Design a protein around this ligand. Structure first.
Ligand SMILES: CCCCCCCCCCCCCCCCCC(=O)OC[C@H](COP(=O)([O-])OCC(O)COP(=O)([O-])OC[C@@H](COC(=O)CCCCCCCCCCCCCCCCC)OC(=O)CCCCCCCCCCCCCCCCC)OC(=O)CCCCCCCCCCCCCCCCC
Ligand SMILES: CCCCCCCCCCCCCCCCCC(=O)OC[C@H](COP(=O)([O-])OCC(O)COP(=O)([O-])OC[C@@H](COC(=O)CCCCCCCCCCCCCCCCC)OC(=O)CCCCCCCCCCCCCCCCC)OC(=O)CCCCCCCCCCCCCCCCC
Ligand SMILES: CCCCCCCCCCCCCCCCCC(=O)OC[C@H](COP(=O)([O-])OCC(O)COP(=O)([O-])OC[C@@H](COC(=O)CCCCCCCCCCCCCCCCC)OC(=O)CCCCCCCCCCCCCCCCC)OC(=O)CCCCCCCCCCCCCCCCC
Ligand SMILES: CCCCCCCCCCCCCCCCCC(=O)OC[C@H](COP(=O)([O-])OCC[N+](C)(C)C)OC(=O)CCCCCCCCCCCCCCCCC
Ligand SMILES: CCCCCCCCCCCCCCCCCC(=O)OC[C@H](COP(=O)([O-])OCC[N+](C)(C)C)OC(=O)CCCCCCCCCCCCCCCCC
Ligand SMILES: COC1=C(OC)C(=O)C(C/C=C(\C)CC/C=C(\C)CC/C=C(\C)CC/C=C(\C)CC/C=C(\C)CC/C=C(\C)CC/C=C(\C)CCC=C(C)C)=C(C)C1=O
Ligand SMILES: CCCCCCCC/C=C/CCCCCCCC(=O)OC[C@H](COP(=O)(O)OCCN)OC(=O)CCCCCCC/C=C/CCCCCCCC
Ligand code: HEM
Ligand code: HEM
Lengths: 176, 95, 84, 454, 54, 69, 79, 354
C-alpha cells in the first residue's frame, strides 16, 4: 500500500525538524547581493517615492482620526474574531471611553461634520488595545492547537448547525 | 449579528418572531447615555441642509483633490495616445 | 519543572503539519469515489467521441455493427453508406 | 501505527499468582500481598444461564439463604463467629459466574475457609429462612422497586437472547419465585456446586502451601464432578426492540442500544475493551476537570454542543462478555426531547470507528483503560475478583505486563478492522424505558451503522 | 506629533498602517524588555521568565 | 446589577469556513494557469519560433518539402 | 480482563468531611461509604450500566453554554 | 409570510450614517422587476421567426408598443450602469473584506446578467446581432462539435434564436431567486458603514431608509424618462437596424456599451484563447482580493489611490474598444492590461514588516 509508505515518509520528515528554530529567530546576515541592493535602490527609493507617499498617507490618516475624534485602535472592526475576543476582556473604564468616542465619530461622519479643532490635539496612535489583543491571540492559539488539530467528523445538518464546524445555530443559508 | 457580548439579552421575555433581526443588532451600552430629540413636526426641516452646505462641499473637494495627480497622469496618457494615433495613420497612409 | 513546561509547550509545535495530515487523510478516504465518477462521465459523454474512439474505449466490444437497427440518423443505419 | 512499547519495569514487579489443581479438580489460586487484610473465597462456574426455565431463580434464592445457618452452626452463631474474627462474608450470583468470599484479617484467613466450606457443602436451608426470603425476593422482583439501569440491563438480555438461557434473569420470574422450595435448592447445589467448577482464591499475607492444605482438608467431601454441560450452538443474537413507553415517570428517558460482541477468549476482546474505553462515559453532574465542550472524547464534545444545552445527561459504554457470546453498546439517560440527538450522536460515534478514528483518541483511551484496570487491582478484594473472574473466563490470569503487551499491538487500524468486520452495517437491539416519543424504529436506527460519506 | 512610524511595514502591496496581525507565536518567544517599557502580554509572559523577580 | 463581569468565551470560535478556502484555492489555481498560458503564447512562443528560424539559417537542418507526412 | 470500575472516574474524595479512616466504619459496606460494593438484589452485572454520580439527574440542564447567555434567558434561533 | 416581511422591511435596522451610495442596491431590485415585466409583455407581440420584423410591428402597430420597446432596451442599459456603479461602490469601501458571502452571491448575479444581456441583444436580429454572436461563438471552436450543438446548424439561424430565447426567458427568473440569497446574507451579515467600525446608531428601514431610497430612485427616474423619450445619450448602436446579410460584414462588429471592456481585451491580445482567459481573469481575480491579508485591518478609508486607477483603467479600456483596430491603440491597450495586473497584485499581496 502506497499510503502506508507515504505515512512513514511524513512521520520521519517531521521527526527530523522538531525543535527547529523559526526563520525569524535566526541571526541572519544579508548576502553580498542584498547588501548592494540596499545600498543603492533602497535609499533613493525612500527619498523619492516610498518616503513621501507613505508620509502623505499616514498624515492623512492621522487627520481623519483627529477629525472624527477617535483613536486608531477604535477603528478596528469587531467582525474580526481576534478583535471580538479581545473586546470581551477589556476593562470597563477603557470600554466606556471607547464607546463614547466611536459614537461621536459616527454622528460627526453621518452629519458631515468634523471635531472642533480645540479637541484635536491628541496622539491618535496610542496602542491601548495591545495588551488585550495579545492575550486574545494567546487564548485562540491554545484553542487552535489543543482542540482543532484535525478535521473532525460530525453528524450533518442537525441541531441547527451544518456539522462542518460552525457553532451558532441558523448561521448559514443552508441552515436558514 | 453583533458580538455575542453585545447581543446577550438582559430580559427573559422571548424575542418576538418579527424582531429577530432587530435584536441581533443589539448593543451593550457601557456607562449609559442620554438621548434627546424633537418631533419633525415642531422643527425646521430644511435649514440643516443650508447650514451644513459650505462645510460639506469644502471637505468633499479637499478629499477628492487627492486624485488630482493620478487623473492628470491618466489624462496625459490619453493625449499622447490620441496624437500618436494620428501621426501613425498619416505616416502609413497620407502622402 | 521548567523542563516539564518546555515539553508541554512544545508538544504542539508542529500544528500545521498535523492539520495538513488530517486533511490528507480525509482526501485519502475520498479517492475511492473516482471508481464511479469516471465511468459515469464517459457513460454520458460516449456519444461525443468519434466512432474509432468509441471502439477503442470499449476494447472493441462496441463498433459500427452494434448501432441500433433504427439509428438516430436513419440514413446511416447499418453503416455510413446504409444497408446496401 | 506503532508507537513503541509501554511496558515498564514496575509492571514486572508483582507477586506471581500460583494456581494448583487439587486431586478432586478444584483449582486453588493465591497471590501474596504485603497487607494486613486478606480476601478468601470460592468463585464457582454457575448461574442463571445454567438453570432451566422452570427452575430459573433457584440460584439467586440459594445465594441469599446460604449464609442463613448451616447444619453445624446457626444463623446467630455463624454471624457471631464472623464478627468475632472481624470479618464479613459476601456473595453474589450472575448469569454465568457466582462467588462466595470473605474479607478478613490475617489471622482469620484459615478460619474463614472453614466457614465458607461449611456454608457451601452443608447448607441448612431451613423452611422459615426460605419463606422470609421469599417475601424479600418478591418485593425485589417488583419493577417499581428496581432501578431503571437494572431494568434495562435485564431487558437487553431478554431482547438479544430470545432463543437461549442467557435471556433469563438472575432473580427469575415471579411464578418461579413463588414455588421454589428446599428441594430445588438442594438439587442446584448437587448439580452445579462441584469441585471441577470451583476456584479457591486467597489474596493477602497468605502462603500457597498452607491454603492448599486447608482447602484439601475442608473440601474433601465435595462432589468431584458433574456431567459435562450440554453442547449448544452459538447464542443467536436477535435484532429486536423492547421499549416500555411510559409518559408518567418524569422527564428522563433511559435507552440501551446493543451490538453483538465477542466472547471472553476471542482474540478481539481486548480490541472491544479499547473501543469501550473510547466511547467512554459522561455525566452532566460530574463533568471532571475538562468540560464537555472541550473534551477529547469526540462523542462527549459533539454532544455538549447540541442546542447550546447538551444532549446527554448521562451515558456510558458497555462491553459484556460470556463464554460464547458478548454484547457491546451504550446506555443513555437523557431528556425526552433529546433522545433522537443522543442516540444519533452515540451511533455516529460507533460508526466512526469503522471510518475515521484518530491515533490521538486511541492513545488517550489506552491510558485511561490502563488506569481503570490497574486501579481496580489496588485492594485485595479487587485482586481476588480479578483472579477468580479471569481463571473462570480464561483458565489463567493475564498479567498486567501481558495485557499491556497485547494492548500495545492494537492501534487505530486494528480498531478499524475489527469494527468494519463486526460493527459496521451490523444488526442492533434497542431497549428503553420512559418517555420515548423521540426514539425511532429499529430499522431507522440500524441505518446509522454505516455512512454515505467515505 | 504622533508616535506612529509611517514606514512600519515594507514590500509590495497597498499601503497600510496598523499595530496588530494574526500570525502565530513560537513556543519560545523572545523575552520582552519590560525594564525599558516593552509590553509583556500573551506568550512572552507565559512561555518566558520575564515575570520573575528576585 | 452593574456592568456584566468579564468572561472569555469557550472556544474554538473559528472553523467551518472551508467553502471559502476552496474558492480561494480554485481561483488561485486557474489564474496561475492563465498566467502561464498567456506568458507562453503571447511572449515566449513567438520568440521561440523566431529563434527556430535563425537556426534554419544554418540550412543544414532545413525541413524537407517532399516529406508529405 | 474484567473492568471493576465505571468508565467515568469519580475524582472526588473518598472520605466524608470530618470522618477519617479510623471512624468511617467499614468502607466496603457502610451506607455512607462512597466506595461500598453495591448490593446485588437483582443479581450481578448491572453495575456496568449504573450511574455512580450521587447527584440526581436534572433533565435538560445546560452544559453547552459558552458564555453567550445569562441564566434564565432563552436563546432564539441560536442568537 | 407577513411576519417575514415585517422582520426584513418594517423592523429591519440599518445605520444612520450611510450615504446615497447605499441606495444603489434598491434601485437595481426595482429596475430588475421592470425589465422582467416589460419583457413578458413584449413577448405577447414579438415574432421569434423574424426579430427584425417583430420590433417594427411593435413600434408601429401596437398601441403604446414603442414604450415597451424602448423601455426594455434602455432599462437594460440602466441595469448595467447601476450594477457597475454598485460594483465600484463595493470596491471603494472594500465591503468584500468581511462580507465575502455577500460578494459571492452578487458575483453569481453578475455572471448570469452577462449571459442574459448578450442573448437578448441577439434577439434583435440585426446585422450586429448576427455578426456579434458569430464572432463570439468561434472562440469555442477549439472544443470539437461544440459549436454545432449550440447553434443547431452550421451557421446561426432561427434555430439558434429559438433556443437562446428560452434561456433569455428563464434565466432572469433564476437571477431573481439569487437576489433572495443576496438579501438573506445582507440581513444576517450586517451591512458595512461609511466608518470602519461598528457603532450603535441604527434606525428602522421603512420609516427612514425607504423614504430616502425612494427619493434616489425618483431622481434616477427623472433622468431615465428623459433618455427614454428623447435619447439624450446614444446607448444603442445604429448598425443593428440594418437587415442581416450573411455575406457582408458591417462597418464594425461591437457589442453594447456595457460589454466594451471585455470586447477590447479580446481585440488586444494576439492569441484568441489568451484573450478569453484574460476575460476570465478579471472577473474571477476580484473574488479573492482580501484572502491573503494577515493584518487586523480592512484597508478602508485611506486615499484609495489603487482604486481610482482601476476605475479609470476600466474607462480607458472601454474607450479603446470603440476605436478601430489601429496598431497604436493596440500597443497602449496592452500597457493598460499590464498596468491592471500590477494594480491587482497590489491588492492581493500582504505586507512584510520593517
Ligand atoms: C521527483 C522524484 C522522483 C519521482 C518518482 C515517482 C514515483 C512514482 C511513480 C512510480 C509508480 C509505481 C506504481 C506501482 C504500482 C504497483 C501495482 C501493483 O503491483 O499493484 C499493487 C497495488 C496496490 O495494492 P495494495 O497493496 O492492495 O493497495 C491497494 C491500494 O490501491 C494502494 O493504494 P493507496 O491506498 O496508497 O491509495 C492510492 C492509490 C490511488 O491513487 C490515485 O488514484 C490517486 C488519485 C489522486 C487524484 C487524481 C485526480 C485526477 C487527476 C488527473 C490529472 C490528469 C492530467 C493530464 C495532463 C495532460 C497534459 C499534460 O494509488 C494506487 O492505486 C497506485 C497506482 C499504481 C499505478 C497504476 C495506476 C496509475 C494511474 C493510471 C492512469 C492511466 C490513465 C490513462 C488515460 C488514457 C487516456 C486515453 O495495486 C493497485 O491497487 C494498483 C492499481 C490501482 C488502480 C489503477 C487503475 C487500474 C485500471 C484497470 C482497468 C481494468 C479494465 C478491465 C476491462 C474489462 C473489460 C471486459
Ligand atoms: C488535463 C486534465 C486535468 C484533470 C485534473 C482533475 C483534477 C480533479 C480535481 C477534483 C477536485 C479537487 C478539489 C481540491 C480542493 C482543495 C481545497 C483545499 O485545500 O481545501 C482545504 C480546506 C481546509 O481549509 P482550512 O482553512 O484548513 O479549514 C477549513 C475550516 O475553516 C476549518 O476546518 P476544520 O477541519 O476545523 O473544520 C471541520 C470540518 C471542516 O469542513 C469543511 O471545511 C467543509 C466546508 C463546507 C462544505 C460545504 C459547502 C456548502 C455546499 C457548497 C455547494 C453548493 C451547491 C452544491 C449542489 C449543486 C447542485 C446544482 O471538517 C470536516 O467536516 C472533515 C470532513 C469533511 C468531509 C465530509 C464529507 C461529507 C460532506 C460532503 C461535502 C464535503 C466533501 C469534502 C470537500 C470536497 C472539496 C472539493 O478544506 C476545504 O476546502 C473543505 C471543502 C470545501 C469545498 C467543497 C467544494 C465541493 C465541490 C463544489 C463544486 C466545485 C466545482 C469547481 C471545480 C471543481 C474541480 C477543482
Ligand atoms: C482558464 C479557464 C478557467 C475557467 C473558469 C471557470 C472554472 C470552473 C468552475 C467555476 C465554478 C466554481 C464553483 C465553486 C463552488 C464553491 C462551493 C462552495 O464552497 O460553496 C460554499 C461556499 C460558502 O463557504 P463557507 O461559508 O465557508 O461554507 C460553510 C457553510 O456550511 C456553507 O453553507 P452556506 O449555506 O453558508 O453556503 C452555501 C452556498 C453555496 O452556493 C453558492 O454560494 C453558489 C455555489 C454554486 C455556484 C453556481 C454554479 C453554476 C455552474 C453550473 C451550471 C452551468 C450550466 C452550463 C450549461 C451549458 C449549456 C450549454 O449557498 C447555497 O448553497 C445556495 C443554494 C441555493 C439553491 C436555490 C435553488 C432553487 C430553490 C430550490 C429548487 C427549486 C424549487 C423547487 C421546484 C420544484 C418544481 C415542482 O460558497 C462560497 O463562498 C463561494 C460561492 C461562489 C463564488 C464564486 C466562485 C468563482 C469561481 C472561480 C472561477 C470563476 C471564473 C469566472 C466565471 C464566469 C462565469 C460567467
Ligand atoms: C507487461 C506486459 C503486459 C502484457 C502481458 C501479456 C498479456 C496481454 C497482452 C495482450 C496483447 C494482445 C492484444 C491483442 C489486441 C487485438 C486487437 C485487434 O486486432 O482488434 C481488431 C479490432 C477490429 O478491427 P477492425 O475495426 O478493422 O474490424 C474489422 C472487422 N471485420 C473483420 C469484420 C472487417 O479493432 C478494434 O476493435 C480497435 C480497438 C482495439 C481494442 C483495444 C486494444 C486491445 C485490447 C486487448 C485486450 C486483451 C484482453 C483479452 C481480450 C478482451 C476482449 C474479449
Ligand atoms: C472531467 C472533470 C470531472 C470532475 C468531477 C467532479 C464530480 C463532482 C460530483 C459532485 C457530486 C456530489 C455528491 C454529494 C452527495 C451528497 C453529499 C454527501 O455525501 O452527503 C453525506 C451525508 C452524510 O451521510 P453520513 O455519512 O453522515 O450518514 C449517516 C447515516 N446515514 C447513512 C443513515 C445517513 O449524506 C447525507 O445525509 C445525504 C443523503 C445521501 C445522498 C447520497 C448521494 C445522492 C446521489 C444522487 C443521485 C443522482 C446521481 C446522478 C448522477 C449521474 C451521473 C452524472
Ligand atoms: C465579438 O464581439 C464581442 C461581443 O459582442 C458580440 C461581446 O459581447 C463580448 C463579451 C460578451 C460576454 C462577456 C458574454 C457573452 C455571453 C454569451 C456568449 C452567452 C451565451 C449563452 C449562454 C451561456 C446560455 C446558456 C445558459 C446558461 C449556461 C445558464 C447561465 C447561468 C449560470 C450557469 C449561473 C447558474 C446556473 C443557472 C442559473 C442554470 C440553472 C439551471 C437549472 C434551473 C436547471 C434545472 C434542471 C433540472 C433537471 C432541475 C466579447 C468579449 C466580444 O468580443
Ligand atoms: C452538480 C451539478 C451537475 C450539473 C450537470 C449538468 C448536466 C450535464 C449533462 C450531461 C450531458 C452529457 C453530454 C451528452 C452528449 C450527447 C452526445 C450525443 O448524443 O451525440 C449527439 C451528436 C452525435 O453526432 P455524431 O454524428 O455521432 O458525431 C458527433 C461527434 N462524434 O453530437 C454530438 O455527439 C455532439 C456532442 C457535443 C458534446 C460537447 C461536450 C463538451 C461540453 C463542455 C461542457 C463544459 C461545462 C463546464 C461547466 C462549468 C460550470 C462552472
Ligand atoms: C435583466 C433582465 C433582462 C435584460 C438585461 C434584457 C435585455 C434585453 C436586450 C438588450 C434586448 C434587445 C434590445 C434591442 O432589441 O436592441 C432584449 C430583447 C428581448 N427581451 Fe429581454 N432582457 C431581460 C429580461 C427579459 C425577460 C424576463 C423577458 C421575457 C419574459 C425578455 C424578453 C425579451 C424579448 C421578447 C426581447 C425581444 C424584443 C427586442 O427586440 O427587444 N427579456 N432583452
Ligand atoms: C442583480 C444585481 C444585484 C442586486 C439586486 C444587488 C442588491 C443589493 C442590495 C439591495 C444591497 C443592500 C443595500 C446596499 O448595500 O445598497 C447590496 C449589498 C451588497 N452587494 Fe449587491 N446586488 C447586486 C449585485 C452585486 C454584485 C455583482 C456584487 C459584487 C461584485 C454585489 C456585492 C454587494 C456587497 C458587497 C454588498 C454589501 C454592501 C455593504 O456591505 O454595505 N452586489 N446589494
Amino acid at each position: 500500500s502506497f499510503h502506508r509508505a507515504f505515512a512513514r515518509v511524513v512521520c520521519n520528515y517531521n521527526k527530523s525538524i522538531e525543535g527547529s528554530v523559526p526563520w525569524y529567530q535566526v541571526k541572519r546576515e544579508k548576502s553580498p547581493f542584498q547588501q548592494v541592493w540596499d545600498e543603492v535602490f533602497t535609499p533613493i527609493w525612500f527619498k523619492l517615492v516610498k518616503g513621501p507617499y507613505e508620509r502623505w498617507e499616514y498624515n492623512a490618516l492621522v487627520a481623519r482620526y483627529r477629525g472624527m475624534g477617535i483613536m486608531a485602535d477604535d477603528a478596528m472592526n469587531d467582525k474580526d474574531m481576534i478583535v471580538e475576543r479581545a473586546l470581551d476582556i477589556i476593562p470597563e473604564d477603557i470600554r466606556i471611553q471607547r464607546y463614547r468616542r466611536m459614537m461621536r465619530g459616527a454622528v460627526l461622519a453621518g452629519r458631515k461634520l468634523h471635531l472642533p479643532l480645540e479637541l484635536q490635539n491628541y496622539d491618535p496612535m496610542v496602542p491601548y488595545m495591545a495588551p488585550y489583543i495579545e492575550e486574545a491571540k494567546f487564548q485562540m492559539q491554545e484553542e487552535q492547537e489543543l482542540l482543532a488539530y484535525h478535521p473532525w467528523d460530525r453528524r450533518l445538518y442537525t441541531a441547527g448547525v451544518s456539522g462542518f464546524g460552525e457553532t451558532s445555530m441558523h448561521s448559514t443559508f443552508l441552515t436558514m | 449579528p453583533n458580538t455575542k457580548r453585545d447581543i446577550r439579552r438582559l430580559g427573559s421575555y422571548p424575542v418576538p418572531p418579527e424582531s429577530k433581526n432587530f435584536w441581533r443588532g443589539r448593543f451593550q451600552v457601557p456607562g449609559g447615555q442620554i438621548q434627546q430629540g424633537v418631533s419633525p413636526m415642531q422643527q425646521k426641516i430644511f435649514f440643516q441642509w443650508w447650514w451644513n452646505l459650505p462645510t460639506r462641499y469644502f471637505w468633499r473637494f479637499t478629499k477628492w483633490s487627492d486624485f488630482l495627480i493620478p487623473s492628470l497622469m491618466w489624462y496625459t496618457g490619453f493625449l499622447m495616445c490620441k496624437n500618436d494615433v494620428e501621426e501613425g495613420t498619416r505616416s502609413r497612409y497620407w502622402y | 519543572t521548567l523542563a516539564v513546561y518546555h515539553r508541554l509547550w512544545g508538544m504542539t509545535e508542529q500544528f500545521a503539519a498535523r492539520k495538513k495530515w488530517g486533511w490528507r487523510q480525509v482526501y485519502h478516504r475520498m479517492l475511492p469515489f473516482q471508481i464511479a465518477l469516471y465511468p459515469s462521465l464517459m457513460w454520458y459523454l460516449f456519444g461525443w467521441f468519434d466512432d474509432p474512439y468509441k471502439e477503442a474505449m470499449t476494447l472493441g466490444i462496441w463498433n459500427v455493427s452494434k448501432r441500433s437497427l433504427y439509428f438516430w440518423d436513419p440514413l446511416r443505419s447499418g453503416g455510413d453508406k446504409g444497408w446496401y | 501505527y506503532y508507537w513503541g512499547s509501554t511496558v515498564t519495569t514496575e509492571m514486572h514487579n508483582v507477586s506471581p499468582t500460583q494456581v494448583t489443581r487439587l486431586p478432586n479438580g478444584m483449582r486453588v489460586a493465591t497471590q501474596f500481598s504485603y497487607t494486613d487484610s486478606a480476601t478468601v473465597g470460592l468463585w464457582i462456574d454457575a448461574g442463571a444461564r445454567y438453570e432451566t426455565k422452570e427452575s430459573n431463580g433457584t440460584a439467586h434464592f440459594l445465594e441469599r439463604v446460604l449464609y442463613l445457618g448451616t447444619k453445624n452452626r446457626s444463623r446467630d452463631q455463624l454471624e457471631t463467629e464472623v464478627e468475632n474474627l472481624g470479618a464479613n462474608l459476601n456473595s453474589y450470583t450472575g448469569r454465568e459466574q457466582t462467588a462466595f468470599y470473605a474479607k478478613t484479617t490475617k489471622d482469620g484467613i484459615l478460619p474463614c475457609i472453614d466457614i465458607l466450606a461449611d456454608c457451601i457443602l452443608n447448607p441448612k436451608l431451613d423452611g422459615d429462612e426460605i419463606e422470609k426470603e421469599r417475601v424479600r425476593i418478591t418485593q425485589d422482583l417488583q419493577a417499581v422497586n428496581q432501578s431503571y439501569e437494572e431494568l434495562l440491563y435485564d431487558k437487553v438480555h431478554t431482547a438479544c437472547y430470545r432463543d437461549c438461557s442467557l435471556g433469563q434473569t438472575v432473580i427469575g420470574p415471579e411464578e418461579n419465585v413463588a414455588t421454589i422450595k428446599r428441594d430445588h435448592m438442594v438439587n442446584y447445589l448437587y448439580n452445579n456446586f462441584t469441585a471441577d467448577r470451583m476456584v479457591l482464591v486467597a489474596v493477602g499475607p497468605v502462603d500457597h502451601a498452607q491454603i492448599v492444605k486447608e482447602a484439601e482438608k475442608k473440601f474433601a467431601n465435595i462432589r468431584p464432578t458433574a456431567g459435562p454441560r450440554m453442547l449448544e450452538e452459538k447464542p443467536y443474537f436477535c435484532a429486536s426492540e423492547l421499549v416500555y413507553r411510559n409518559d408518567d415517570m418524569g422527564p428522563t428517558a433511559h435507552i440501551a442500544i446493543a451490538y453483538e460482541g465477542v466472547p471472553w477468549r476471542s482474540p478481539d476482546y481486548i480490541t472491544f475493551m479499547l473501543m469501550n474505553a473510547i466511547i467512554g462515559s459522561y455525566d452532566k453532574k460530574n463533568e471532571g476537570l475538562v468540560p464537555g465542550l472541550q473534551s477529547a472524547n469526540r462523542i462527549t464534545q459533539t454532544g455538549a454542543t447540541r442546542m447550546d444545552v447538551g444532549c446527554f445527561d448521562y451515558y456510558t459504554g458497555f462491553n459484556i462478555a460470556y463464554k460464547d457470546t458478548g454484547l457491546f453498546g451504550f446506555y443513555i439517560a437523557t431528556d425526552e426531547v433529546a433522545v433522537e440527538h443522543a442516540v444519533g450522536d452515540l451511533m455516529f460515534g460507533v460508526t466512526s470507528f469503522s471510518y475515521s478514528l484518530t491515533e490521538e483518541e486511541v492513545m488517550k483511551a489506552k491510558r485511561e483503560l490502563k488506569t481503570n484496570f490497574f486501579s481496580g487491582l489496588d485492594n485485595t478484594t479487587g485482586v481476588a475478583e480479578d483472579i477468580g473472574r479471569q481463571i473462570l473466563a480464561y483458565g489463567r490470569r493475564l498479567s498486567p505486563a501481558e495485557f499491556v503487551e497485547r494492548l500495545d499491538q492494537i492501534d487505530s487500524q486494528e480498531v478499524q478492522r475489527v469494527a468494519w468486520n463486526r460493527l459496521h452495517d451490523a444488526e442492533i437491539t434497542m431497549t428503553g424505558v420512559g418517555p420515548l416519543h423521540g426514539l425511532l424504529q429499529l430499522w431507522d436506527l440500524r441505518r446509522q451503522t454505516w455512512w454515505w460519506r467515505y | 506629533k504622533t508616535r506612529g512610524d509611517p514606514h512600519i511595514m515594507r514590500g509590495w502591496g497597498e499601503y497600510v498602517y496598523c499595530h496588530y496581525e494574526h500570525l502565530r507565536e513560537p513556543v519560545f518567544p523572545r523575552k520582552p524588555d519590560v525594564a525599558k517599557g516593552e509590553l509583556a502580554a500573551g506568550a512572552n509572559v507565559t512561555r518566558t521568565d520575564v515575570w520573575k523577580r528576585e | 446589577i452593574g456592568p456584566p463581569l468579564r468572561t472569555a468565551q469557550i472556544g474554538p470560535t473559528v472553523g467551518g469556513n472551508g467553502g471559502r478556502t476552496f474558492v480561494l484555492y480554485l481561483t488561485t489555481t486557474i489564474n496561475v494557469l492563465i498566467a502561464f498560458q498567456v506568458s507562453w503564447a503571447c511572449y515566449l512562443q513567438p520568440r521561440w519560433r523566431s529563434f527556430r528560424s535563425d537556426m534554419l539559417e544554418k540550412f543544414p537542418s532545413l525541413q524537407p518539402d517532399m516529406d508529405e507526412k | 480482563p474484567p473492568i471493576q470500575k465505571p468508565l467515568l472516574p469519580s475524582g472526588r474524595a473518598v472520605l466524608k468531611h470530618g470522618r477519617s479512616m479510623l471512624c468511617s466504619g467499614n468502607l466496603s459496606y457502610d451506607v455512607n461509604s462512597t466506595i461500598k460494593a453495591p448490593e446485588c438484589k437483582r443479581g450481578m452485572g448491572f453495575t456496568q450500566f449504573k450511574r455512580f454520580t450521587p447527584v440526581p439527574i436534572e433533565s435538560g440542564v445546560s452544559v453547552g453554554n459558552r458564555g453567550w447567555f445569562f441564566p434564565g434567558v432563552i436563546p432564539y434561533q441560536g442568537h | 409570510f407577513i411576519l417575514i416581511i415585517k422582520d426584513n422591511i418594517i423592523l429591519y435596522n440599518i445605520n444612520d450614517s450611510i450615504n446615497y451610495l447605499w441606495n444603489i442596491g434598491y434601485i437595481i431590485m426595482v429596475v430588475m422587476i421592470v425589465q422582467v415585466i416589460t419583457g413578458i409583455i413584449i413577448n405577447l407581440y414579438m415574432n421569434i421567426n423574424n426579430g427584425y420584423k417583430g420590433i417594427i410591428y411593435i413600434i408601429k402597430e401596437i398601441y403604446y408598443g414603442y414604450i415597451l420597446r424602448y423601455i426594455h432596451n434602455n432599462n437594460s442599459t440602466l441595469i448595467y450602469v447601476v450594477v457597475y456603479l454598485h460594483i465600484i461602490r463595493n470596491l471603494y469601501y472594500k465591503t468584500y473584506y468581511y462580507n465575502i458571502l455577500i460578494w459571492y452571491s452578487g458575483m453569481i448575479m453578475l455572471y448570469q446578467l452577462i449571459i442574459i444581456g448578450f442573448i437578448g441583444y441577439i434577439l434583435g436580429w440585426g446585422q450586429l446581432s448576427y455578426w456579434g454572436i458569430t464572432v463570439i461563438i468561434n472562440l469555442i471552436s477549439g472544443i470539437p462539435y461544440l459549436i454545432l450543438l449550440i447553434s443547431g446548424n452550421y451557421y446561426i439561424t432561427i434555430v439558434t434564436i429559438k433556443r437562446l430565447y428560452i434561456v433569455h426567458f428563464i434565466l432572469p427568473i433564476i437571477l431573481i431567486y439569487v437576489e433572495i440569497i443576496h438579501v438573506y446574507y445582507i440581513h444576517y451579515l450586517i451591512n458595512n458603514n461609511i466608518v470602519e467600525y461598528n457603532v450603535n446608531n441604527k434606525i428602522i428601514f421603512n420609516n427612514y431608509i425607504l423614504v430616502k431610497d425612494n427619493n434616489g430612485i425618483i431622481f434616477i427616474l427623472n433622468i431615465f424618462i428623459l433618455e427614454l423619450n428623447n435619447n439624450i445619450f446614444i446607448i444603442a448602436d445604429n448598425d443593428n437596424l440594418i437587415e442581416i446579410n450573411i455575406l457582408v460584414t458591417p462597418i464594425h462588429i461591437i457589442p453594447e456599451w456595457y460589454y466594451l471592456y471585455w470586447y477590447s481585451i479580446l481585440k488586444l491580445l494576439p492569441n484568441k484563447y489568451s484573450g478569453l482567459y484574460i476575460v476570465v481573469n478579471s472577473i474571477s481575480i476580484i473574488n479573492i482580493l482580501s484572502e491573503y491579508k494577515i493584518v487586523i485591518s480592512e484597508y478602508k478609508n485611506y486615499k484609495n489611490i489603487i482604486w481610482y486607477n482601476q476605475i479609470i483603467q476600466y474607462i480607458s479600456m472601454i474607450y479603446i474598444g470603440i476605436q478601430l483596430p489601429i496598431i497604436e491603440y493596440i500597443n497602449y491597450g496592452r500597457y493598460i492590461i499590464i498596468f491592471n495586473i500590477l494594480l491587482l497584485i497590489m491588492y492581493l499581496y500582504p505586507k512584510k514588516k520593517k
